[PDB]
Design a binder for this molecule. Structure first.
Ligand code: NA
Lengths: 181, 182
């Protein structure tokens, strides 16, 4: 009665009450660093973050290699950056779905999902002023194993989207300032 | 003829082929994800489509996503909003380097740092006005090259202009999420 879907709902409840009292606690900052490794290969590191009124440098660094397939001028030294964007979207939607279900006391047995997005490289290459540079659209499907109706499953999915930071960062315009140091 | 480790001959060849046959430039990228309990889930990258053919030749790449303790996880992986920064960082870096290469501009080194801020009240449903996503993301590039600040700033402008992940963040991209019928 303290844990649903492997989420500690007591901790969730305490976090919500803490934020209601002191909204400043809810301000988080996430960070990365990246070093170019030649050609299409580069390496990103995740380490510290800020939140709940303090810097947190407690985690072992998490290192990621990004590259391209040969047709996009790389050697598959890692997944490509637009693939990493789908990874991020998939983790966020899944967590948002599961955590919102947990908060409602809705048990789920299994969750999986699939993702496909369309990109026309004429954008990246500056060959057409029509074509978007980014994803034109992304299509996601979820499968949920639970004692729920299809309508109730669809509701969980709508709530997942509504509360997902990565979903909303994709679907809405978010400003990105890129500067010389 | 290689600049910044980029095969510029292949690049120009690809461009000419696309001008003749624009459909070559249509790619589809994919992922699958399985929930692993709590805030932990796992994404897999394998196949893609592009240049008028399916490519299922790559070995799968698997990524673990989780949360720190204060965000209800157990450090079973970096969190999804961190992976978004990872994506952005790779894309801006490759776009910068590749566009420099196409112009014959050699770079000794490139590095960058990223921060975005988020108010959890969005995710937690505690405010209807608060953005659920990032409020803003800020990126700083350091470029080691035989270039003035203004020349570096031009490479950075072009990086952003032509970066798919930058434009996916900066612009509204439609995303349809549905219950699977297969
Ligand atoms: Na966006």
């Amino acid at each position: 009665t303290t844990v649903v879907n492997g989420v500690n709902v007591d901790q969730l409840m305490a976090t919500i009450e803490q934020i209601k009292a002191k909204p400043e606690i809810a301000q988080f900052k996430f960070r990365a660093t990246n070093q170019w490794m030649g050609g299409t290969h580069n390496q990103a590191t995740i380490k510290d973050f800020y939140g709940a009124c303090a810097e947190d440098d407690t985690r072992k660094p998490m290192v990621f290699d990004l590259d391209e397939p040969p047709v996009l001028l790389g050697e598959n030294r890692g997944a490509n950056p637009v693939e990493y964007l789908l990874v991020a979207l998939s983790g966020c939607l899944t967590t948002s779905l599961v955590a919102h279900a947990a908060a409602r006391g809705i048990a789920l047995r299994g969750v999986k999902s699939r993702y496909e997005g369309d990109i026309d490289l004429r954008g990246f290459l500056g060959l057409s002023e029509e074509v978007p540079v980014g994803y034109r659209e992304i299509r996601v499907f979820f499968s949920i194993d639970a004692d729920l109706t299809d309508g109730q499953k669809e509701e969980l999915i709508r709530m997942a989207q509504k509360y997902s930071p990565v979903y909303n960062t994709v679907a809405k315009p978010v400003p990105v300032a890129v500067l010389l140091d």
